[PDB]
Amino acid sequence: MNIFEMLRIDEGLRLKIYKDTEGYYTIGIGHLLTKSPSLNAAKSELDKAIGRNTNGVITKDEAEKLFNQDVDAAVRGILRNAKLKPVYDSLDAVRRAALINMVFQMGETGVAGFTNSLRMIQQKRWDELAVNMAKSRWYNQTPNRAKRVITTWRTGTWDAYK
Numbered sequence: 001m002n003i004f005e006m007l008r009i010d011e012g013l014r015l016k017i018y019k020d021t022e023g024y025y026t027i028g029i030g031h032l033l034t035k036s037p038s039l040n041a042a043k044s045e046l047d048k049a050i051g052r053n054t055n056g057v058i059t060k061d062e063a064e065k066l067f068n069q070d071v072d073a074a075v076r077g078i079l080r081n082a083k084l085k086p087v088y089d090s091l092d093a094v095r096r097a098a099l100i101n102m103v104f105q106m107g108e109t110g111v112a113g114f115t116n117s118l119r120m121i122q123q124k125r126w127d128e129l130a131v132n133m134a135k136s137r138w139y140n141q142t143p144n145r146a147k148r149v150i151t152t153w154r155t156g157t158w159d160a161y162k
């Protein structure tokens with residue numbers, strides 16, 4: 001088990017443009033295309049991203065490429081963020097994967113804003129953290145996913161993914 005396998009599980013894989021859980025144009029493996037209501041604006045972003053006229057459709061190899069790029073940006077984002085970086089450095093490997101997962105889904109900004117959880121993470125107060133994270137839109141909107149991630153944080157193992 002690793003970050004790649006983890007996110008593939010949580011995000012699924014789809015070769016056609018689609019609406020995410022928030023109604024956003026997305027494709028491949030959780031790759032957000034646009035927050036805009038327009039399918040054309042979405043098709044346009046996708047062609048720009050892929051470098052070709054796709055027609056709202058990509059191949060497997062193309063989704064994986066976007067995925068690679070996205071995992072990489074998440075990591076680099078974390079390491080560039082003043083609030084995030086130290087958090088990341090204080091963690092074990094499984095738990096660093098839980099942070100990337102969240103960053104992937106909600107962005108640096110979203111994550112950085114979970115201030116109280118951040119302090120707990122650092123103090124390594126596992127159980128409390130799990131309770132705190134549950135008190136969130138994130139958890140209310142995508143419970144099963146958030147539960148997997150929260151267990152990950154709580155236990156430091158990959159059990160939720162097995």
Ligand SMILES: [Cl-]
Binds near residue numbers: 049
């Ligand atoms: Cl892109």
Ligand SMILES: [Cl-]
Binds near residue numbers: 144145
């Ligand atoms: Cl869910």
